[PDB]
Amino acid sequence: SVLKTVIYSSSGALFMGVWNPSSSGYSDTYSRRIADLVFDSGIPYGIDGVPHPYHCHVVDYKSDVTVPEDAVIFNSTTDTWVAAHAGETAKTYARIECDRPYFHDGHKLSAADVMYSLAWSWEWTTQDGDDDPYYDASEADWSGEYMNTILGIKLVEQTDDRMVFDVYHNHYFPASEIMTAAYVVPFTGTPWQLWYAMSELVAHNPKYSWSESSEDVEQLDQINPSHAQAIKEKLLELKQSKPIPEFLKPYIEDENAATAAYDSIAKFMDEHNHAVIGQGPYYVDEYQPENLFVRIKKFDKWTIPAFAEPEYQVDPYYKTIEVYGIQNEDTAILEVANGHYDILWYPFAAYRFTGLSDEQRANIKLYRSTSAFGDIVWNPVHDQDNPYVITVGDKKYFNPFAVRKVRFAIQYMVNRAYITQNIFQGSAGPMFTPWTSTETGFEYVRPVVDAFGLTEQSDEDLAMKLFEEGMQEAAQELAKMGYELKKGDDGKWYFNGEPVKVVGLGRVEDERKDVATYIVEEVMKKLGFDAEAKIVDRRTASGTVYTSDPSSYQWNFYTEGWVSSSNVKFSTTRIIQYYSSYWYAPGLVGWKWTPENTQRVTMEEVLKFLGNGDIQAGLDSLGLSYYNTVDKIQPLLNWTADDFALVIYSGEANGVKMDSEDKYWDFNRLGTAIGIYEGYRTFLYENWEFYAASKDIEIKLVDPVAGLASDWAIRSARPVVEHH
Ligand code: NA
Ligand code: NA
């Protein structure tokens, strides 16, 4: 049985990210779609938007429990397990039971794989001395605060088919017990021996990075055949010199079996020309980058995970799944409509599904996608000693988007109705924050949008008034430092006698090229800048914006697209992902908009703007449930989006606890009010798109907002049986 699938590709690239188990791995929807069939989560999100038991389930949950002396964390200075938090109160205790699937090379997953995974996170998030080679600045930003909430873990028991763990942590999510009890999932998708080899390769070979790509640095990629060769060499070196790391010896049943797994892993890598080993239902059989082609095959040792509920007890039918990269949308659609491929595994706008015959339409079924959206990210980079200037070698540039009021003005300059009705031909809706109109939170953060008077039509008078104030303030501060910023008689801005230049990146694959053109011609040029749209593909955009330092100043804005692969009832990541300095700020690598690097908007400043000087009037504008008085807001007045990000994501920040649902929603509202005012991202639109699949395929589990991007769809796909 063969399933033929299409992923929309660029001319040269199927993937926009890399296959690696760090937090910098699987950044993109293209790799993640495939990876979510190769790897199983312990407690995955379901199509209803909450976590569900699968490989793992919660056996016991209590709050406010003493951490015992046999619950450990990994100390990265000594590389030893220490009960560093014994005697503290843990907000959360959870006993979690796991099954033990087989990895794709053939050996069974064990508690050593789980403990390696956690040690790796504790190790690579901390710089243990100024020259620690086992450190990644991106990983620290991604995961550091998460790892700080973990007070201790204990292996209670391991049998041939079960693992039991006691977990102690400080996360309490007030609207969901399972999100509280399963905040730390004692499970992993990668065999420790392979991860050990990758860690040793990245630590000691400057050519390889978990997170970074540049001229002499490649971000580690398990599907890259060349990367796989380097990983295999390191793996076979470690098998001889140090097969079992000291810290893992307490967690290994059998040192001979652990040593033999090195050979099992190497033999798989030899057969398949890659390093991708998971414990999911499909193994990666072959990658042909020159053909934009992937083959994955059903793993004959995979079984329905022990704790799957009935809806998720699906046994993936298809023995082989072929993935074809196709670079033209119309061609992709016609190939599925004419029956040459089974699933169009990337969604397109309604207007692309036009012109099909009654027969072509009868041959397909459509599944909605309403979980994708688009925004502009600005590069606000500047020198430590100068808020408005960036030094690149011998040249100094004025960065207009380092001025808060310039970024804020653009919220009102853009005409989102024009973008949605013209560029997306009516197949998108105006969007102002990171919640789409098909998410639970939409009406909870809407009052923030109304507090700012934001509409689908532009307000160019307000935007021009804010822009001109921002530039006047900038020109005056720069004058005191000996720099001249002046509007010429030609209506253009000059900095030290030269035109202010900005470069916008759009995307060759889709309507984002037209978004970039719109921003360059109808915003940048209208504000008096020399502006240019550079149109690039996935790989270039990823490498320029996300995996290299924005200090190079080689882009000023980028047309971002984001997609959820799952329905999510309660997001804990919107503020940290989009507004905070922790994650994409603007990219994952090098300079970010941290309070150490740049001045950051505070809650008080936004409340004063929204209330025309009166704090209470500002709070009233935001529809708050708990933090709705001057007296209650007092401890939050100096918070930045980073504080809101952290209290939502980790459960606590600066001693303030997220201990009610009212507070969760207020933190999102207040976080979003800062995010709009600060204007590092200008949200534009939510996309309304469609997946297509053969009428002869039944898909039982369809995510109502993510459609076929959810691995539950292809896990649940099977031939129609009919005798009509
Ligand atoms: Na370290
Ligand atoms: Na390195």
User: For residue 216, how far is its CA from the centre of ligand 1 (angstroms)?
Assistant: 23
What is the b/e burial string over 175-197, where b = at least 16 CB atoms within 10 angstroms of the residue's CB? eeebbbbbbbbbbbbbbbbbbbb
- Rounded to the nearest whole angstrom, what is the distance from the C-alpha of residue 76 to the centroid of ligand 1? 6
CA 114–ligand 1 middle distance (angstroms): 18
Q: Which of 467, 322, 354, 489 is closest to 401 using CA atoms? A: 467
Q: How far is CA 587 from CA 280, 328, 540, 549, 584, in A?
A: 30, 28, 13, 8, 4
User: Which ligand is nearest to the Cα of residue 201, counting in written order?
Assistant: 2
Distance 23 CA to ligand 1 centre (A): 15
- This structure was determined by X-ray
Ligand nearest to the CA of 203: 2
* Closest to 183 (Cα-Cα) out of 294, 103, 91, 260: 91
Question: Whole-angstrom distance between the N-terminal and C-terminal Cα of the chain?
Answer: 23
Question: Cα separations (Å) of 531 from 351, 505, 511, 555?
Answer: 31, 11, 19, 11
Three-class secondary structure of residue 106 per DSSP: coil
User: Residues 60, 95: contact at Cβ < 8 Å?
Assistant: yes
- Resolution value, angstrom units: 2.3
Whose structure tokens read 């039991």?
164
The ligand whose atoms approach the alpha carbon of 216 most closely is: 2
Q: Which of 8, 4, 52, 3 is nearest to 29 (CA)?
A: 8
Contacts 24+ apart (CB under 8 A), 153-158: 153/71, 153/72, 153/73, 153/115, 153/118, 153/184, 153/186, 154/68, 154/70, 154/71, 154/72, 155/111, 155/115, 155/251, 156/95, 158/110, 158/111, 158/253
How far does residue 127's CA lie from ligand 1's centre (Å)?
A: 5
Q: CA-CA distance, 113 to 120, in Å (whole number)?
A: 10
373/348 Cα distance (integer angstroms): 13
Beta strands in 379-480 (DSSP E): 389-392, 395-398, 428-430
Answer yes or no: are the C-beta atoms of 644 and 608 closer than 8 Å: no
Q: How far is the CA of 653 from the centre of ligand 1 (A)?
A: 24
**Pairing outcome for strands 2-8 and 717-719:** unpaired
Closest among 246, 94, 84 to 164, alpha carbons compared: 94
Strands (E), 458-508: 485-487, 493-495, 498-499, 501-507
Q: In this structure, which ligand is nearest to the CA of 147?
A: 1
Which ligand sits closest to the CA of 126?
Answer: 1
Q: What are phi and psi of 592, to 5 degrees?
A: -130, 165
Q: Which residue has the tokens 């140090």?
A: 242
DSSP 1: -
Question: What is the Å distance from ligand 2's center to 539 Cα?
Answer: 21
Residue type, 672: T
Length in residues, the chain: 724
Contact 78, 122 (CB under 8 A): no
Q: How many A from CA of 259 to the centre of ligand 1?
A: 25
Q: How many Å lie between the centroid of ligand 2 and the Cα of residue 583?
A: 21
Residue 277, class by beta-carbon neighbours within 10 Å (0-12 exposed, 13-18 middle, 19+ buried)? buried
Distances (CA, A) of 4 to 335, 342, 344, 570: 11, 5, 9, 34
Taking the C-alpha atoms of residue 34 and residue 655, their distance in angstroms, rounded to an integer, is 41
DSSP string, 229-257: HHHHHHHHHHHHH-SS-GGGGGG-S-HHH
Q: Which of 617, 560, 615, 613 is nearest to 587 (CA)?
A: 560
Report the C-alpha gap between 172 and 290 in whole angstroms: 48
Spacing, Cα 138 to ligand 1 middle (Å) = 12
Which ligand ends up closest to the CA of 77? 1
93 contacts 168 by C-beta, under 8 angstroms: yes
Q: Does residue 658 contact residue 646 with C-beta atoms inside 8 Å?
A: no
Q: What DSSP letter does each residue of 699-712 carry, written as one string?
A: ES--BTTTBTTSHH
β-strand pairing of 293-298 with 320-326: antiparallel
